């Protein structure tokens, strides 16, 4: 019976909240490892949660986030509610659900030369700051557009409020199963985002006489994409497991995060 | 058996394609009714066959769903998204109609209710979009958009579109929507010229409920479903859009995938594709 | 003195601010006419003074330009862009009205002509926008937009806006326009829900001519100027928008710069500014 | 009596068009220098023209472009028309006009630590590929928005069809005098482009505890922007001089470049 606890910076292991967790779980005959098992419990922002998710997937166990700083979308609770939260952690009475996760393959000469995964996005980007990356995007084995661009995002419904949003994308609800493709600064008439069923294959071909390009998954894991490769992104067989509490529904997290005007609501 | 044939106009009943349909099916002793884009007109038919553009197709789909039978469309002039073939392959199409051996799938449809003082005062459906639009040409309609029981934004606007994946290519696109594959089951919301910082398209699971509140103080507003069925929305009322339990039955042929339809309609640049 | 006062509604003639204006100017033996938002109503006046929102202001500016005199606006409830002060500083404002010592600048105005078969059949002007809008609620209006004698795009749409820098904050913004500083002299074109890959806003020099052609085969269309002056646009006709040689005379006070007006109206996040 | 001739790559000095120029001008007692005076004549695309413009400004003399490859916006003619073009070059009968050019100042501690200029754009961009650049944009001595972003473009009406276009900007006619500001992937509700009179000052403040950022002018000249600096962009006193021929007006160059649908035009 153990748990992994993840927290933001190095000094962050001693704060009130961390301390409270370490005390309460010890006292209940649960061992506890501290970084930065049956669960990964994490204290911090969305960026820190992504990390924790990264370790929860290796082990194939649920993640559960508790927010510390400025609010985000991924936490199931805030630091004020830690007692209530730890009560569900010791009891193990929380719902667990699979969340759509992306698989990415880098293919050169028909051969898989690398791979990755993302719960948030796969971000394909220009290598050298001079110029544009030429790309062909393909959706279900058929080409949709070729253009030069800063890149292309392939995002989950969960990643839709992040980099994908900045790049011009729509907002997708997190219980949706779909894949979202957002051209990042496409030099073209048509550079609109596209949304596909979760069964589809998105492939992106990188110009063969251009420079190497890069891909960042969940803003943290980096693969080099060689000139002339094909990136294939599909829904991964294996999902990340999310601990779910009785928390604010996404609409409220959206309104809160962007300070959305909601006055006049009757209901 | 019988087949209901839908054509665009009365003087389209005499087109070469339309003439072929009448000959072929007549030769196979399949009774044909013809009509120009009768709520019960396809009662007894095994299929609604349509020749024409996407707008004609939408009329045929209504009649097909009234009867609970498949709709199949062949396009004529204007290139579109919903037809399974072009006029030149009418013989091949007629072969599949006579043998009755095409696939039939469900296509998602939207339920729309108008609610005043807690009760349902009108109801409609859509395969393409529900478009809530301002009454007067003058001002702005104040709305609150509410997603799953919870308010997401309030703003003045020309209106709000609630669209299927199929409708995303239509009026939703014009208003700034993303392109959705007709393969997907989701609901798309597109604020129409919202005077607001946040007027972004939103996409929801197909089990979602989208509600829009119309300002109590202002003018009545209008709803257009699939560009033709109109309801009046009283000020202070509220529109509720969900997935309808009754889908349209969509005949399928071995036809071009949606990706090809998109590239063709918009002339999308595609050179250098398989190159890697 | 004389001054013409414009208020929003008849039962706004009795507001505390409106009452103050009548007292102050009456005490200085300045004749006051009052009216609610008379094409010649400000004939003889040295100023049109307005109390209310941006819409009320636009009515006053019309009357001021009819008389060739300055307009000055004070806002009441709703925060806007065109007033030079808020209600709470009415005494300070009245001081500048009595001494007649405010600056007056030219604000750019648009000339709009409706042309059929090579001749002018109607004419209008605008300080905010010209909005060409589809007649029927149903379909799409086909247009060709032509910039300086040359076609730039043809598409179906709900309409096309031709806006001043001042109007860019208004209906043009809702339709997806960029924000222009009222300092600039330019013309902005914003396609309204264009069903097209390219429906981007375009910005032109103030010496440009923007013409829009309305499809010959389709329905008549409508033009709204500054949200109130309506003309009917016959199918096959053509709208020509240029800068009018007659500007509006814009009284200025020591007021907030446009940047502050924008931040305030849209609640724009601004924290950490001078930090470098 | 001399002219500078600029051409794309190294092998490019021997092509039919270059050769024709070198012959015709020699024969007319005009000396000619060849790279990559009364005029800078340039053969190539928009990218090569930008370079030539860079050398025409040092000398304070007109540039005149003749297009070789795929069409752009800056050339006054194409390679088929070189004889006609050279006839105006020998005669010196062409119109010359000043085009709006941007001045940029990098200011740290109230002190000018660098500077640049642009006929196309000033592109302020994220330094390290991880994360976002925090920025405050100010327009006439007053703050308009703070956000994180990939960057901010400050563009001329001429640069509006380029990187600024890819980033979501409107199209501006080249005889307009204005300045265009386009937030590049702003994580904010308001990230719309803004257009100012040519008299205005655009300033951009970079977060003081972030990373250093970069600026690229006309896609070629690079300055490092230190954390906590202020970029100031104004209209430069000194303009680039453009040789003007009897060429396609910009509307036609737009339609041609993006293959814009124009059928049905009556006129």
Swiss-Prot record, chains A, D:
Keywords in alphabetical order: ATP-binding, Cytoplasm, Kinase, NAD, NADP, Nucleotide-binding, Transferase
Active-site residue list: 46 (proton acceptor)
GO biological process: NAD metabolic process; NADP biosynthetic process
Family, as annotated: Belongs to the NAD kinase family.
Principal place of residence: cytoplasm
Record protein name field: NAD kinase
Binding site for NAD(+): 46-47, 51, 120-121, 150, 161-166
Entry-linked InterPro entries: ATP-NAD_kinase_N, ATP-NAD_kinase_PpnK-typ_C, NAD/diacylglycerol_kinase_sf, NADK
Superkingdom, natural source: Bacteria
Cellular compartment(s): Cytoplasm
Molecular function as annotated in GO: ATP binding; metal ion binding; NAD binding; NAD+ kinase activity
Function, in words: Involved in the regulation of the intracellular balance of NAD and NADP, and is a key enzyme in the biosynthesis of NADP. Catalyzes specifically the phosphorylation on 2'-hydroxyl of the adenosine moiety of NAD to yield NADP.
EC number assigned by the record: 2.7.1.23
GO cellular component: cytoplasm
Pfam families hit by this protein: NAD_kinase (PF01513), NAD_kinase_C (PF20143)
Substrates-to-products reaction catalysed: NAD(+) + ATP = ADP + NADP(+) + H(+)
Essential cofactor(s): a divalent metal cation
Gene3D superfamilies assigned to the protein according to its UniProt record, in alphabetical order: Probable inorganic polyphosphate/atp-NAD kinase, domain 1, Probable inorganic polyphosphate/atp-NAD kinase, domain 2
HAMAP family xrefs: NAD_kinase (MF_00361)
């Amino acid at each position: 019976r153990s748990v992994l606890l993840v927290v933001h910076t190095g000094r962050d292991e001693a704060t009130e909240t961390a301390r409270r967790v370490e005390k309460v779980l010890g006292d209940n005959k649960i061992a506890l490892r501290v970084l930065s098992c049956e669960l990964v419990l994490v204290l911090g922002g969305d960026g820190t949660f992504l990390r924790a998710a990264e370790l929860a997937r290796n082990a194939s166990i649920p993640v559960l986030g508790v927010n510390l700083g400025r609010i985000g979308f991924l936490a199931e609770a805030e630091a004020e509610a830690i007692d209530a939260v730890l009560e569900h952690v010791v009891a193990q009475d929380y719902r667990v659900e699979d969340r759509l996760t992306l698989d990415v393959v880098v293919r050169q000469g028909g051969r898989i030369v690398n791979r990755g995964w993302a719960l948030n996005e796969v971000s394909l980007e220009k290598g050298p700051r001079l110029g544009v990356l030429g790309v062909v995007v393909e959706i279900d084995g058929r080409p949709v557009s070729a253009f030069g661009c800063d890149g292309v995002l392939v995002s989950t419904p969960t990643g839709s409020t992040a980099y994908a949003f900045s790049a011009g994308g729509p907002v997708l609800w997190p219980d949706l199963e779909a894949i979202l493709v957002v051209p990042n600064n496409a030099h073209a008439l048509f550079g609109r985002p596209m949304v596909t069923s979760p069964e589809a294959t998105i492939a992106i071909e990188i110009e063969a006489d251009g420079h190497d390009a890069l891909v960042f998954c969940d803003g943290r894991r980096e693969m080099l994409i060689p000139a002339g490769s094909r990136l294939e992104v599909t829904r991964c067989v294996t999902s990340v497991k999310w601990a779910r509490l009785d928390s604010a529904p996404f609409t409220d997290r959206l309104v809160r995060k962007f300070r959305l005007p909601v006055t006049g609501w009757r209901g």
